Design an enzyme around this catalytic site. Sequence first.
Site, PDB file in Angstrom:
ATOM      1  N   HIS A 139       8.260  22.306 -18.801  1.00  0.00           N
ATOM      2  CA  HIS A 139       7.950  21.609 -19.822  1.00  0.00           C
ATOM      3  C   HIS A 139       8.381  20.262 -19.969  1.00  0.00           C
ATOM      4  CE1 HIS A 139       7.581  25.712 -21.246  1.00  0.00           C
ATOM      5  NE2 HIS A 139       8.796  25.983 -20.789  1.00  0.00           N
ATOM      6  N   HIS A 166      16.894  14.445 -21.873  1.00  0.00           N
ATOM      7  CA  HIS A 166      15.326  14.810 -21.515  1.00  0.00           C
ATOM      8  C   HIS A 166      14.581  14.169 -22.171  1.00  0.00           C
ATOM      9  CE1 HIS A 166      15.896  17.724 -24.964  1.00  0.00           C
ATOM     10  NE2 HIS A 166      14.584  17.288 -25.217  1.00  0.00           N
ATOM     11  N   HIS A 169      10.453  13.495 -24.201  1.00  0.00           N
ATOM     12  CA  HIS A 169       9.001  13.975 -24.550  1.00  0.00           C
ATOM     13  C   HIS A 169       8.058  12.571 -24.228  1.00  0.00           C
ATOM     14  CE1 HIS A 169      10.483  17.502 -26.243  1.00  0.00           C
ATOM     15  NE2 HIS A 169      11.625  16.618 -26.653  1.00  0.00           N
ATOM     16  N   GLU A 180       8.230  12.389 -30.855  1.00  0.00           N
ATOM     17  CA  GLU A 180       8.318  13.407 -31.411  1.00  0.00           C
ATOM     18  C   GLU A 180       8.521  13.010 -32.765  1.00  0.00           C
ATOM     19  OE1 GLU A 180      10.997  16.509 -29.673  1.00  0.00           O
ATOM     20  OE2 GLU A 180       8.931  17.444 -29.036  1.00  0.00           O
ATOM     21  N   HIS A 210      16.123  12.645 -25.776  1.00  0.00           N
ATOM     22  CA  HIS A 210      16.857  13.463 -26.522  1.00  0.00           C
ATOM     23  C   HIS A 210      18.148  13.440 -25.580  1.00  0.00           C
ATOM     24  CE1 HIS A 210      13.231  15.063 -28.934  1.00  0.00           C
ATOM     25  NE2 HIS A 210      13.808  13.819 -29.312  1.00  0.00           N
ATOM     26  N   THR A 215      11.727  22.477 -29.327  1.00  0.00           N
ATOM     27  CA  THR A 215      10.915  23.347 -28.269  1.00  0.00           C
ATOM     28  C   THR A 215      11.607  24.908 -28.792  1.00  0.00           C
ATOM     29  OG1 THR A 215      12.975  22.914 -26.913  1.00  0.00           O
ATOM     30  CG2 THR A 215      10.853  21.781 -26.558  1.00  0.00           C
TER      31      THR A 215
HETATM   32  C1  LIG Z   1      21.498  24.402 -22.389  1.00  0.00           C
HETATM   33  O1  LIG Z   1      20.400  24.648 -23.199  1.00  0.00           O
HETATM   34  C2  LIG Z   1      19.519  23.750 -23.824  1.00  0.00           C
HETATM   35  C3  LIG Z   1      19.715  22.414 -23.809  1.00  0.00           C
HETATM   36  C4  LIG Z   1      18.792  21.568 -24.622  1.00  0.00           C
HETATM   37  C5  LIG Z   1      17.818  22.269 -25.185  1.00  0.00           C
HETATM   38  N1  LIG Z   1      16.892  21.088 -26.204  1.00  0.00           N
HETATM   39  C6  LIG Z   1      15.853  21.051 -25.524  1.00  0.00           C
HETATM   40  N2  LIG Z   1      14.743  20.713 -26.436  1.00  0.00           N
HETATM   41  S1  LIG Z   1      15.057  19.791 -27.668  1.00  0.00           S
HETATM   42  N3  LIG Z   1      13.906  18.478 -28.212  1.00  0.00           N
HETATM   43  O2  LIG Z   1      15.045  20.863 -29.007  1.00  0.00           O
HETATM   44  O3  LIG Z   1      16.141  18.999 -27.861  1.00  0.00           O
HETATM   45  O4  LIG Z   1      15.164  21.793 -24.621  1.00  0.00           O
HETATM   46  C7  LIG Z   1      14.043  21.421 -24.029  1.00  0.00           C
HETATM   47  C8  LIG Z   1      13.335  22.810 -23.581  1.00  0.00           C
HETATM   48  C9  LIG Z   1      11.944  22.512 -23.016  1.00  0.00           C
HETATM   49  C10 LIG Z   1      11.394  21.291 -22.645  1.00  0.00           C
HETATM   50  C11 LIG Z   1      12.566  20.003 -22.837  1.00  0.00           C
HETATM   51  C12 LIG Z   1      13.847  20.327 -23.648  1.00  0.00           C
HETATM   52  C13 LIG Z   1      17.727  23.335 -25.291  1.00  0.00           C
HETATM   53  C14 LIG Z   1      18.530  24.434 -24.845  1.00  0.00           C
HETATM   54  O5  LIG Z   1      18.278  25.934 -24.714  1.00  0.00           O
HETATM   55  C15 LIG Z   1      17.536  26.327 -25.860  1.00  0.00           C
HETATM   56 ZN   LIG Z   2      13.658  17.146 -26.920  1.00  0.00          ZN
END
Ligand SMILES: COc1ccc(N[C@H](NS(N)(=O)=O)Oc2ccccc2)cc1OC
Ligand SMILES: [Zn+2]
Length: 257
Positions: free
Chosen positions: A61, A91, A93, A103, A116, A196
Amino acid sequence: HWGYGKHNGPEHWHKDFPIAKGERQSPVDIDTHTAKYDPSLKPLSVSYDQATSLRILNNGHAFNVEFDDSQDKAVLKGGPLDGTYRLIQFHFHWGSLDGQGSEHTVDKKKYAAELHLVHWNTKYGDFGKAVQQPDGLAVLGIFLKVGSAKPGLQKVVDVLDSIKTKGKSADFTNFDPRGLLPESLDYWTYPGSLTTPPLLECVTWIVLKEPISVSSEQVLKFRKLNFNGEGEPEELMVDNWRPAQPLKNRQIKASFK
Ligand SMILES: COc1ccc(N[C@H](NS(N)(=O)=O)Oc2ccccc2)cc1OC
Ligand SMILES: [Zn+2]
Protein backbone atom coordinates in the site's frame (compact mmCIF):
# COMPACT_ATOMS: atom_id res chain seq x y z
CA HIS A 1 -8.25 -7.03 -0.09
CA TRP A 2 -8.48 -3.22 0.02
CA GLY A 3 -6.51 -0.87 -2.17
CA TYR A 4 -6.75 2.39 -4.10
CA GLY A 5 -8.06 1.24 -7.48
CA LYS A 6 -11.52 1.58 -9.08
CA HIS A 7 -12.63 -1.75 -7.68
CA ASN A 8 -11.12 -1.74 -4.17
CA GLY A 9 -10.44 1.93 -3.38
CA PRO A 10 -11.73 4.35 -0.75
CA GLU A 11 -15.30 4.34 -2.05
CA HIS A 12 -15.49 0.58 -1.40
CA TRP A 13 -13.89 0.41 2.05
CA HIS A 14 -17.11 0.98 3.97
CA LYS A 15 -18.39 -2.50 3.01
CA ASP A 16 -15.68 -4.28 5.03
CA PHE A 17 -15.06 -1.35 7.40
CA PRO A 18 -18.35 0.35 8.20
CA ILE A 19 -16.55 2.94 10.35
CA ALA A 20 -15.46 4.59 7.08
CA LYS A 21 -18.69 6.59 7.28
CA GLY A 22 -18.13 7.32 10.97
CA GLU A 23 -18.26 10.64 12.85
CA ARG A 24 -14.51 11.11 13.20
CA GLN A 25 -12.91 10.02 9.91
CA SER A 26 -9.69 11.28 8.32
CA PRO A 27 -8.37 12.98 6.40
CA VAL A 28 -10.24 16.27 6.24
CA ASP A 29 -10.05 19.55 4.41
CA ILE A 30 -8.52 22.22 6.67
CA ASP A 31 -10.46 25.43 6.09
CA THR A 32 -8.01 27.99 7.39
CA HIS A 33 -10.72 30.58 7.85
CA THR A 34 -12.77 28.31 10.11
CA ALA A 35 -9.94 26.88 12.22
CA LYS A 36 -9.47 28.82 15.47
CA TYR A 37 -6.38 29.83 17.37
CA ASP A 38 -6.33 27.89 20.63
CA PRO A 39 -4.28 29.53 23.37
CA SER A 40 -4.83 26.48 25.60
CA LEU A 41 -2.53 24.43 23.39
CA LYS A 42 0.81 23.73 25.07
CA PRO A 43 4.05 23.87 23.04
CA LEU A 44 4.66 20.87 20.79
CA SER A 45 7.72 18.76 21.65
CA VAL A 46 9.21 16.46 19.00
CA SER A 47 11.95 14.48 20.75
CA TYR A 48 13.58 12.27 18.17
CA ASP A 49 17.28 12.54 19.09
CA GLN A 50 17.58 8.91 20.24
CA ALA A 51 15.35 7.39 17.54
CA THR A 52 16.19 3.86 16.51
CA SER A 53 15.01 2.98 13.02
CA LEU A 54 15.01 -0.72 12.14
CA ARG A 55 13.74 -1.56 8.69
CA ILE A 56 11.85 -0.37 5.64
CA LEU A 57 8.98 -2.30 4.15
CA ASN A 58 6.79 -2.27 1.07
CA ASN A 59 3.43 -3.45 2.40
CA GLY A 60 1.60 -3.31 -0.91
CA HIS A 61 0.00 0.00 0.00
CA ALA A 62 2.91 2.30 0.87
CA PHE A 63 6.38 1.83 2.34
CA ASN A 64 6.87 1.90 6.10
CA VAL A 65 9.97 2.86 8.05
CA GLU A 66 9.62 1.08 11.40
CA PHE A 67 11.23 2.05 14.67
CA ASP A 68 12.13 0.36 17.93
CA ASP A 69 9.35 1.40 20.26
CA SER A 70 10.36 -0.86 23.17
CA GLN A 71 11.33 2.32 25.07
CA ASP A 72 10.78 6.11 25.02
CA LYS A 73 13.51 6.70 22.37
CA ALA A 74 11.55 8.89 20.00
CA VAL A 75 8.53 10.68 21.40
CA LEU A 76 5.92 13.32 20.70
CA LYS A 77 4.57 15.30 23.66
CA GLY A 78 2.74 18.55 24.39
CA GLY A 79 0.63 20.40 21.92
CA PRO A 80 -2.89 19.02 22.30
CA LEU A 81 -1.50 15.83 23.77
CA ASP A 82 -1.82 14.41 27.28
CA GLY A 83 1.20 12.31 28.17
CA THR A 84 3.79 10.64 26.00
CA TYR A 85 3.40 9.13 22.55
CA ARG A 86 6.03 6.84 21.11
CA LEU A 87 7.06 6.82 17.42
CA ILE A 88 6.40 3.40 15.87
CA GLN A 89 6.75 4.07 12.14
CA PHE A 90 6.38 6.60 9.36
CA HIS A 91 5.09 6.37 5.86
CA PHE A 92 3.98 8.54 2.95
CA HIS A 93 1.03 8.99 0.62
CA TRP A 94 1.71 10.50 -2.78
CA GLY A 95 0.28 11.17 -6.23
CA SER A 96 0.73 10.23 -9.86
CA LEU A 97 1.37 13.91 -10.60
CA ASP A 98 2.53 16.79 -8.42
CA GLY A 99 -0.97 18.34 -8.26
CA GLN A 100 -2.25 15.59 -5.97
CA GLY A 101 -1.05 13.13 -3.37
CA SER A 102 -1.75 14.50 0.06
CA GLU A 103 -4.60 13.25 2.20
CA HIS A 104 -5.32 16.37 4.18
CA THR A 105 -5.97 19.47 2.11
CA VAL A 106 -5.63 23.15 3.07
CA ASP A 107 -8.44 25.33 1.73
CA LYS A 108 -8.96 22.48 -0.77
CA LYS A 109 -5.30 22.70 -1.87
CA LYS A 110 -3.72 19.30 -2.55
CA TYR A 111 0.03 18.79 -2.04
CA ALA A 112 2.25 16.38 -3.94
CA ALA A 113 2.58 14.02 -0.97
CA GLU A 114 2.01 13.71 2.78
CA LEU A 115 4.30 12.26 5.48
CA HIS A 116 2.71 10.45 8.43
CA LEU A 117 4.70 9.92 11.64
CA VAL A 118 2.68 7.45 13.68
CA HIS A 119 2.89 7.46 17.49
CA TRP A 120 1.06 5.53 20.26
CA ASN A 121 0.08 6.61 23.78
CA THR A 122 2.39 4.82 26.21
CA LYS A 123 -0.26 4.78 28.92
CA TYR A 124 -1.85 1.87 27.02
CA GLY A 125 1.33 -0.23 26.96
CA ASP A 126 1.36 -1.39 23.32
CA PHE A 127 0.15 -0.26 19.90
CA GLY A 128 -2.58 -2.88 19.70
CA LYS A 129 -4.15 -1.74 22.98
CA ALA A 130 -3.78 1.89 21.97
CA VAL A 131 -5.91 1.36 18.87
CA GLN A 132 -8.83 0.48 21.11
CA GLN A 133 -8.87 3.98 22.60
CA PRO A 134 -10.18 7.39 21.60
CA ASP A 135 -6.81 8.94 22.53
CA GLY A 136 -4.58 6.00 21.60
CA LEU A 137 -2.67 7.51 18.68
CA ALA A 138 -1.11 10.76 17.53
CA VAL A 139 -0.05 11.21 13.93
CA LEU A 140 2.20 14.05 12.85
CA GLY A 141 1.37 15.00 9.29
CA ILE A 142 3.77 16.87 7.05
CA PHE A 143 2.99 18.11 3.57
CA LEU A 144 5.44 17.65 0.70
CA LYS A 145 5.69 20.11 -2.19
CA VAL A 146 7.99 19.78 -5.19
CA GLY A 147 10.99 22.12 -5.46
CA SER A 148 14.46 21.75 -3.97
CA ALA A 149 15.60 18.33 -2.74
CA LYS A 150 15.20 17.34 0.89
CA PRO A 151 18.61 16.05 2.02
CA GLY A 152 17.18 14.07 4.93
CA LEU A 153 14.89 12.21 2.54
CA GLN A 154 17.54 10.95 0.12
CA LYS A 155 18.55 7.88 2.12
CA VAL A 156 14.94 6.81 2.00
CA VAL A 157 14.84 7.46 -1.73
CA ASP A 158 17.98 5.47 -2.33
CA VAL A 159 16.71 2.28 -0.67
CA LEU A 160 13.45 2.10 -2.62
CA ASP A 161 14.98 0.08 -5.47
CA SER A 162 15.62 -2.74 -2.97
CA ILE A 163 11.94 -2.88 -1.91
CA LYS A 164 10.17 -2.38 -5.22
CA THR A 165 7.41 -4.93 -4.67
CA LYS A 166 4.96 -5.94 -1.97
CA GLY A 167 6.45 -7.94 0.87
CA LYS A 168 9.97 -6.69 0.30
CA SER A 169 11.84 -5.15 3.23
CA ALA A 170 15.39 -3.88 3.81
CA ASP A 171 17.58 -3.12 6.81
CA PHE A 172 17.13 0.58 7.52
CA THR A 173 19.03 1.47 10.67
CA ASN A 174 20.56 4.74 11.87
CA PHE A 175 18.03 6.91 10.01
CA ASP A 176 17.18 10.19 11.74
CA PRO A 177 13.58 11.36 11.24
CA ARG A 178 14.56 14.86 12.32
CA GLY A 179 15.76 15.34 8.74
CA LEU A 180 12.18 15.23 7.50
CA LEU A 181 10.85 18.15 9.56
CA PRO A 182 10.22 21.71 8.40
CA GLU A 183 11.61 24.67 10.35
CA SER A 184 8.35 25.62 11.94
CA LEU A 185 6.18 23.42 14.18
CA ASP A 186 3.01 25.54 13.77
CA TYR A 187 0.16 23.02 13.31
CA TRP A 188 -3.55 22.41 13.07
CA THR A 189 -5.02 19.63 15.23
CA TYR A 190 -8.31 17.76 15.25
CA PRO A 191 -9.63 14.38 16.41
CA GLY A 192 -9.76 11.74 13.70
CA SER A 193 -8.84 8.28 12.43
CA LEU A 194 -6.38 6.15 10.53
CA THR A 195 -6.80 6.95 6.83
CA THR A 196 -6.31 3.31 5.88
CA PRO A 197 -8.41 0.26 6.82
CA PRO A 198 -9.34 -0.52 9.44
CA LEU A 199 -9.84 3.27 9.75
CA LEU A 200 -9.91 3.26 13.55
CA GLU A 201 -11.07 6.45 15.26
CA CYS A 202 -8.19 6.57 17.72
CA VAL A 203 -6.11 9.47 16.35
CA THR A 204 -5.15 12.93 17.50
CA TRP A 205 -4.06 14.58 14.24
CA ILE A 206 -1.27 17.18 14.28
CA VAL A 207 -0.80 18.63 10.80
CA LEU A 208 2.11 21.00 10.27
CA LYS A 209 1.44 24.27 8.47
CA GLU A 210 4.84 24.44 6.84
CA PRO A 211 5.43 22.00 3.99
CA ILE A 212 8.80 20.48 3.28
CA SER A 213 10.28 20.69 -0.22
CA VAL A 214 11.32 17.54 -2.09
CA SER A 215 12.84 17.31 -5.57
CA SER A 216 11.03 16.06 -8.66
CA GLU A 217 13.68 13.34 -8.83
CA GLN A 218 12.93 12.29 -5.29
CA VAL A 219 9.17 12.07 -5.75
CA LEU A 220 9.66 10.34 -9.09
CA LYS A 221 11.43 7.52 -7.30
CA PHE A 222 8.40 7.05 -5.02
CA ARG A 223 6.31 6.57 -8.17
CA LYS A 224 8.56 3.74 -9.32
CA LEU A 225 7.47 1.48 -6.45
CA ASN A 226 4.92 -1.29 -7.05
CA PHE A 227 1.63 -2.21 -5.34
CA ASN A 228 1.97 -5.72 -6.73
CA GLY A 229 4.27 -8.51 -5.62
CA GLU A 230 7.38 -9.74 -7.41
CA GLY A 231 6.72 -11.54 -10.67
CA GLU A 232 3.22 -10.09 -10.81
CA PRO A 233 2.06 -7.55 -13.44
CA GLU A 234 3.29 -4.05 -12.68
CA GLU A 235 0.87 -1.64 -11.00
CA LEU A 236 2.80 1.48 -10.10
CA MET A 237 2.40 2.57 -6.47
CA VAL A 238 0.83 5.96 -7.10
CA ASP A 239 -2.19 7.82 -5.73
CA ASN A 240 -2.31 5.86 -2.49
CA TRP A 241 -4.24 8.61 -0.74
CA ARG A 242 -7.73 8.79 0.74
CA PRO A 243 -9.67 11.93 -0.11
CA ALA A 244 -11.14 14.35 2.41
CA GLN A 245 -14.04 13.09 4.56
CA PRO A 246 -16.89 15.04 6.22
CA LEU A 247 -15.82 17.11 9.23
CA LYS A 248 -19.08 16.44 11.02
CA ASN A 249 -19.10 17.72 14.64
CA ARG A 250 -15.40 18.60 14.83
CA GLN A 251 -13.33 21.70 15.52
CA ILE A 252 -9.94 22.19 13.91
CA LYS A 253 -7.66 24.23 16.16
CA ALA A 254 -4.59 26.25 15.24
CA SER A 255 -1.52 26.54 17.44
CA PHE A 256 -0.60 29.87 15.86
CA LYS A 257 -2.42 33.17 15.64
C1 LIG B 1 1.73 -0.80 13.75
O1 LIG B 1 0.52 -0.77 12.97
C2 LIG B 1 0.13 0.38 12.25
C3 LIG B 1 0.98 1.47 12.04
C4 LIG B 1 0.53 2.58 11.31
C5 LIG B 1 -0.77 2.61 10.78
N1 LIG B 1 -1.17 3.77 10.06
C6 LIG B 1 -1.22 3.68 8.72
N2 LIG B 1 -1.96 4.51 8.01
S1 LIG B 1 -2.44 6.00 8.51
N3 LIG B 1 -2.50 7.09 7.30
O2 LIG B 1 -3.77 5.89 9.11
O3 LIG B 1 -1.53 6.51 9.49
O4 LIG B 1 -1.08 2.47 8.17
C7 LIG B 1 -0.86 2.33 6.81
C8 LIG B 1 -1.48 1.27 6.12
C9 LIG B 1 -1.29 1.09 4.74
C10 LIG B 1 -0.46 1.99 4.05
C11 LIG B 1 0.15 3.06 4.73
C12 LIG B 1 -0.05 3.22 6.10
C13 LIG B 1 -1.61 1.51 10.99
C14 LIG B 1 -1.17 0.40 11.72
O5 LIG B 1 -1.97 -0.72 11.95
C15 LIG B 1 -3.33 -0.59 11.50
ZN1 LIG C 1 -0.87 7.65 6.43
